[PDB]
Design a protein around this ligand. Structure first.
Ligand code: EMO
Length: 329
């Protein structure tokens, strides 16, 4: 029992050719056009390398999918094609065929990539507001286009601290939102899983990405990543319940008349709420501001419907200075 408080009819008002990724036909490119130049990472069921080009001869990114169903490949490509152009979203340049074995390869643009395991700890109070903001612009866009990312995490938020640039990547788990549809809950990463996924409220929506965002943010301001250090889907809910309090979860479970399975309810037991301020400590005092906490507090709400929307969040007084810089440039 749930609907999206915003952009719900986006796909209901658009041409079937928009969200029906199955009825797609890939206009592959020439493998010859691209050559691997240096591996650079991993992207969940996909190896990634820094490559070159067709005739431009410029840096790019080659993501050789890990042979999954033809189904998910159309999905990722389609969604990327719909989001091509939006603020801070990764732009797809090509979609060649399998040079080697079993899969095709997506060609993007060079993202000078930097590390959140070393970057984040150096970020200043203002650098955060700035990037979370830029990320928000990216989320409000895909959401405005009826698409949920479903895998927001530090890793899929590549920042170029030098160019002050940010890009949202890996839309391999992304999906089109349709009113009242029940999606699978085996999405995103555990530490950023919204409670909905953990109680099995399948008719979720864009608001899922906002919870994940909240998890990143928290790990940023409190300097404790991951913030919800769960050891498995069940312990993820407990690790959360131990912070937000079980009272909140009970109200949540009733509202959506969802019954928590045995073995899960016991493992969650009953815990009081923990004031955000109790996570403050030396290493994170220069970032934990009343405004930050308030913003964080409005992102991490059991009830997905209670969470802020990408658009609402960008107007929060917390980002007030970041905004006051674009209306001046
Ligand atoms: C869909 C998608 C688009 C991308 O542009 C990247 C990735 C995925 C990705 O997984 C990735 C991993 C990495 O370690 C470095 C990157 O620059 C990347 C990427 O740039």
């Amino acid at each position: 029992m749930s609907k999206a408080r915003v952009y719900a009819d986006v796909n209901v008002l658009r041409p079937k050719e928009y969200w029906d990724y199955e009825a797609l036909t890939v206009q592959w490119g020439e493998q010859d056009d691209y050559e691997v130049v240096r591996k650079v990472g991993r992207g969940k069921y996909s190896e990634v390398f820094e490559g070159i080009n067709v005739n431009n001869n410029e840096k790019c990114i080659i993501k050789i999918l890990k042979p999954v169903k033809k189904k998910k490949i159309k999905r990722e490509i389609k969604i990327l094609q719909n989001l091509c152009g939006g603020p801070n979203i990764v732009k797809l340049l090509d979609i060649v065929r399998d040079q080697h074995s079993k899969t095709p390869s997506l060609i993007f643009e060079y993202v000078n990539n930097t590390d959140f395991k070393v970057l984040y700890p150096t970020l200043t109070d203002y650098d955060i507001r700035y990037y979370i903001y830029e990320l928000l612009k990216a989320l409000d866009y895909c959401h405005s286009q009826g698409i949920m990312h479903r895998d927001v995490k530090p890793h899929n938020v590549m920042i170029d601290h030098e160019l002050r640039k940010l890009r949202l990547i890996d839309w391999g788990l992304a999906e089109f939102y349709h009113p009242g549809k029940e999606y699978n809950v085996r999405v995103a990463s555990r530490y950023f899983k919204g409670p909905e996924l953990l109680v099995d409220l399948q008719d979720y929506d864009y608001s899922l990405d906002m919870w994940s965002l909240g998890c990143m943010f928290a790990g940023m301001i409190f300097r404790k990543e991951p913030f919800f250090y769960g050891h498995d889907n069940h312990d993820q809910l407990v690790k959360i319940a131990k912070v937000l309090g079980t009272d909140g979860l009970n109200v949540y479970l009733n509202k959506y008349r969802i019954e928590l399975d045995p073995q899960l309810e016991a493992l969650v037991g009953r815990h009081s709420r923990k004031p955000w301020l109790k996570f403050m400590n030396a290493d994170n005092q220069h970032l934990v501001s009343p405004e930050a906490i308030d913003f964080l507090d409005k992102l991490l709400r059991y009830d997905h419907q209670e969470r802020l929307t990408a658009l609402e969040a960008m107007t929060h007084p917390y980002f007030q200075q970041v905004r006051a810089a674009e209306n001046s440039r």
